[PDB]
Amino acid sequence: DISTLPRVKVDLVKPPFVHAHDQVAKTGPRVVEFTMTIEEKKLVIDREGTEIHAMTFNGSVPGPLMVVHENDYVELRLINPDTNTLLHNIDFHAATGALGGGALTQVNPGEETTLRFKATKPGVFVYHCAPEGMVPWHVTSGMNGAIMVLPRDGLKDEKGQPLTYDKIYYVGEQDFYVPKDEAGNYKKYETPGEAYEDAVKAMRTLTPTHIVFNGAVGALTGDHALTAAVGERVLVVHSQANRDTRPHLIGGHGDYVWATGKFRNPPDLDQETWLIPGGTAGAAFYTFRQPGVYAYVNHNLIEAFELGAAGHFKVTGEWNDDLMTSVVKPAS
Amino acid sequence: DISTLPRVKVDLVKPPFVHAHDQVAKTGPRVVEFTMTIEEKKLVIDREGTEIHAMTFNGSVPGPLMVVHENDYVELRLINPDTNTLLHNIDFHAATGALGGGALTQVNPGEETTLRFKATKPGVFVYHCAPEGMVPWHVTSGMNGAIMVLPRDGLKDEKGQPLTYDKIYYVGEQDFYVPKDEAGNYKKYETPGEAYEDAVKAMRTLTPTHIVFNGAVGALTGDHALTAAVGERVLVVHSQANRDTRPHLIGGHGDYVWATGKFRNPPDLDQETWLIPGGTAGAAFYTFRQPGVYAYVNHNLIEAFELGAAGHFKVTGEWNDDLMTSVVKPAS
Amino acid sequence: DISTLPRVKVDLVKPPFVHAHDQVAKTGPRVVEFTMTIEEKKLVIDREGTEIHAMTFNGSVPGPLMVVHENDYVELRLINPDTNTLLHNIDFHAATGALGGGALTQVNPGEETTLRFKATKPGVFVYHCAPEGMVPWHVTSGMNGAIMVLPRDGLKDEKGQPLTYDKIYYVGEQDFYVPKDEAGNYKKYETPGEAYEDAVKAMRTLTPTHIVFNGAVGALTGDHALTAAVGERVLVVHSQANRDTRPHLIGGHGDYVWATGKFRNPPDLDQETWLIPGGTAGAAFYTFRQPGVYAYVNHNLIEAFELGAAGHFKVTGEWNDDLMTSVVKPAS
Ligand SMILES: O=N[O-]
Ligand SMILES: O=N[O-]
Ligand SMILES: O=N[O-]
Ligand SMILES: O=N[O-]
Ligand SMILES: O=N[O-]
Ligand SMILES: O=N[O-]
Ligand SMILES: O=N[O-]
Ligand SMILES: O=N[O-]
Ligand SMILES: O=N[O-]
Ligand SMILES: O=N[O-]
Ligand SMILES: O=N[O-]
Ligand SMILES: O=N[O-]
Ligand SMILES: O=N[O-]
Ligand SMILES: O=N[O-]
Ligand SMILES: O=N[O-]
Ligand SMILES: [Cu+2]
Ligand SMILES: [Cu+2]
Ligand SMILES: [Cu+2]
Ligand SMILES: [Cu+2]
Ligand SMILES: [Cu+2]
Ligand SMILES: [Cu+2]
C-alpha cells in the first residue's frame, strides 16, 4: 500500500550539481516527491550571442538530475505556468507504461499534473518532453534531463565490490539545430508557430549547429569549471536525449563506465572514450591521480572544439612525476 | 557427410513476421533449405508519395528473416528472374569465406544459384547484396535482411538460465538516399544507369532522406502495428545494414539486449536504448508489463519522427497502477 | 627508482606493420624509448589526385603503432624540425595527467621535447596532436596514431585462457574534410593560415570528404593488401581519433573483439561488426578459416566504397567446402 510508505520531498539543484542523496539506501522504499516548473525562455548559447527560444524543465538545459533508489516511487508534480505558450509533457525512460508517462502528463499553459511511477530498474536514464507530433522540436530545444535510480546497496564494480563516489556531476549534452538561411547565418522567429517549419527543416539536415554542455558554449569552464582533488572519486553522469556522443576525459580515463547507463551490468574498465547512444544516459567513475586542468569532451573533436561540446575540470593536489614527467622540456 | 543429414525446406514469411521455428533444436544438425527470388520494384516510401526503385529479396524491404540453429547448414537457392535488370548476389555475415557468399552468388537476370554455408556462430546477422563496384547502391536500395542462428539450446540470460520468447518480430531499418535537386525536391530517373551517378552523389552526403522500418513511413502502425499482451515475452530482432541505429521502446525497455547480436555473449540488462552499428543485427527481449500503445523508435528522434524510423506496438491487458499512475490528471 | 630500470630503444615501423615485441613480457618493467619526428607534407589521398597538406607523426597517416606492456614507462622524444611551419604536441590517451602529455610537449619548429609516462592501463589507445585552439584541424590532417599497452601476461579470452596472435596489423582510419567550393570541387591553399577558416568551415559540416585507411584510398590493396594464411591468428588494431567507425571483415568475423580497446574487459565474441567510437582504438582477433580475398571495411558501406574506408586481405591456403560451397554455380 503506497499510502503507508514514507514520503520525502526533494529540492532539486541546477546542473551540473546534483541534489543530496545517499548512495546506499538509509531507509526502505519511499515515495520521492519532486516538483518541476516548465520554463520557455530565451537563452544565449554561444560566444557570438546566438539566442534561441529554449524549452526547459526548471529553467535549465539540461533539466535537473533526479536521484532515487530502485523500487522507490517517483512522484513528479509538473507545472506549466500560463506564462508559457506551448503544450508540454514528460517521458521518463526509467518508467514503465504510457509512453514513459508522456501519455498521462500533457499540460497546457496554466495546468499542472502529478505522475507517479515505480523505479523498477537501476541506472541513469533520460527524461524528456514528447508532445505528439512535436517530439524532436521540444527535445532539441533543451527539454530533457536525466534521472538516476541507484541500486539500494549502491554501486558495484565488475567483481561485486563497492564503488563509492565522493562527488557527482551531471553533464547534459544538447544538440541544437538553429535554422540557417542560404548564406549560413541563423534565422530568428517571431512566434513558435512561425518557427516550426524551418525548425523541422534544420533538424532534417541531421547536422547540429551547436553541441553544448550545460546549455551553452563554455558553460562548464572558468568560474563554472568542474572541480576535484587528487584522490577523489568522481561520478560523471552524461546524457544525450537525441544524438550519440563519445565522452572522454582528456588526461584521464573512465575507470569504471556504464556507457549505456544500467547498473545491473558490470562496468567497462579503463575506458579512454565510450559511446553513449542518443536517447541514453551513461555514467563514468574516475579517481583523479594528477592535479591540473582537464578537458571533458565529446571526442568528435569538431563537435567538442568547434561546436561546443567541451568543459573543464580544475583538480587540486600534488603532481606525481612517476605517472608523468617532462624529461626534457621543449627546447631548440 | 552432408548428404546423410536431414533436409528441411523453409517457407519464408514477410517481415516483421518470422517463419516458424523451434528455439531449442528438436533435431540434430540439418541442411535448412531456403529460396529467395529477387525483385526490383517501385515502392512508395512516404506519405507524400515518394516512389523509388527498390531492390529486394523476396519482394520486401527488409528481406525476410531466416532462422536456423548453430551448426546447421544454410542452403539458399537465389533466383534473379529475367524481369529484373541488374546483376545481384548475396553476402551473409553469418557465413565464412568468399565475401560471405557474394563471390559465389553473382546472378545476372535470368539466372539462379545455390549456396551452402555452415552457420558456425550463433547470433543475428545481416545479409545483403554486394555486387562489386555497386555495393552501397544495392544495400541502400533495400537489398538487405537478416538471419538468426539460434544456439541449439536456445537463448540464455547473463546467468546461463533460459530465456524463451513467446513472440518474435523482425524490424529492418532502411536508410534511403533519394536524390535531391538544388531546391530540395526528389529526382526521378528513367533507367538505373541514368540514376547511378546521382545515387552516388546522394549517398556521399551521408544524410539519408528517409529512415524507415519495414520499407515505408508508418509501415508498422495502424492495422500493421506490432502486437503483444501483458506478460508476453517478445524478441525484437533489428537490423541496419549500412548505418548506426539506436532502438528504444517508448514506455518499455530492453530487458536483455544483444546490441551487436551475438548470443555467446551475455546480454546487457535493463537497457533504455542500445547502439546497433551499421552492418549489424541486434536483438532485444522484453516482457510487457503494461497495456496500451508503445512506440518503437530509433532514438535519434529526428530520424524517428521526421524521417520515418518509428513503429508501434498495441498491447492488450490489465493496467498496473503500482508501476504507473496519474495521481492528479492534468488540470488548471 | 626509474633510473634503475632497463632502457630499451624501439625502432618504429610504418603502418600497417607493427614493430617487433613480445606478447608476454620477457623482462620486468622497462623504460621503452621511442623517437618520432613530425613531418608536414603533401599527400595524395584519392584516385583523382586530390592533394592535401598532411600533418604527420613519422611521415605516415596514421602515425606508427607503439607497443609496450602495462607498467612500463613510455619515454618519447618528439622532434619538430625547422622544415615544418606549425606548432605541434602530443596527447596520449594511455597516459595520466597534463592533457595526456599535450600540456608538456608543445614544440615549435626547430624544437624537441622528451615526455615520460607510466602506462598504467592495458589496452590499445589513441594518441594525437592537440595544440590549444587548433585541435581538430591537426587531428583531421592526419596527426594521430595509437599505442598498445599489453598486459604483462599477454591477451586473454572471456574465460581467462590465453589468446596469442601470429600476426598483428594496425589500421588507422582517417576522416578528412577537404574544403569545397559551392560547385563541389576541392579548394587548395597557399599557406596554412590562409587555409584555416575554410578548414574550420569544412569540419563544421561534420561530413568527411574522404575516409581512408593508411592515409589514402586503396592504400591497403594490391601489392599492399594485408596477408594471412588459413589457420593464422591475426590481431587487427583499428583507431579513429575523431569519428565513429564500424569495422567488419567481409567473409570473416571478429572472433574476440575489444571494441573500445581495453584488455581488462572480456572481449565480445563472434562479432560481425563492432562500433569503435571516435577518440578510441579497438582490437579484433580472428583465426582465418578460408583462403581468398577479404575486404576489411567500415560498414557504413558508403564510407567504405565511396569515401575510401576499405582495405583487403589476401589469404593463402586450402578451401573448406564444409564451411562454404557453391552447390549450383550461377546459371540460366
Ligand atoms: O515490484 N514489481 O515491479
Ligand atoms: O567511501 N569510502 O569507500
Ligand atoms: O549520430 N548520432 O545520432
Ligand atoms: O585527448 N583528448 O582529445
Ligand atoms: O548499461 N550498461 O552499462
Ligand atoms: O564445424 N567446424 O566448423
Ligand atoms: O516458455 N516457458 O518458459
Ligand atoms: O552513423 N552511422 O553510420
Ligand atoms: O521515450 N522515447 O522517446
Ligand atoms: O554481440 N553481443 O551482443
Ligand atoms: O604504479 N602506480 O600507478
Ligand atoms: O602460440 N601458440 O598458442
Ligand atoms: O559519428 N561519429 O562521430
Ligand atoms: O559484408 N560486408 O559488407
Ligand atoms: O574496452 N573494452 O573492450
Ligand atoms: Cu515541451
Ligand atoms: Cu525517449
Ligand atoms: Cu542487388
Ligand atoms: Cu556486409
Ligand atoms: Cu600537430
Ligand atoms: Cu584525445
Author numbering:
A (entry chain A), B (entry chain A), C (entry chain A): 8 to 339
Text of the article:
Copper nitrite reductase (CuNiR) is part of the microbial respiratory N-oxide reduction denitrification pathway and catalyses the reduction of nitrite to form nitric oxide, a process with key agronomic and environmental impacts. CuNiRs are homotrimers, where each monomer contains a type 1 Cu centre (T1Cu) with a role in electron transfer and a catalytic type 2 copper centre (T2Cu) where nitrite binds and is converted to nitric oxide. Rapid, shutterless X-ray detector technology on a synchrotron MX beamline was exploited to perform low-dose serial crystallography on a single copper nitrite reductase crystal, which survived long enough for 45 consecutive 100 K X-ray structures to be collected at 1.07–1.62 Å resolution, all sampled from the same crystal volume.
By ds4 (2.76 MGy accumulated dose) the nitrite had stabilized into a single ‘side-on’ conformation as observed previously in wild-type AcNiR structures. By ds4, the nitrite population converges into the ‘side-on’ NO2 conformation similar to that observed in previous studies, where it remains for a further six data sets.
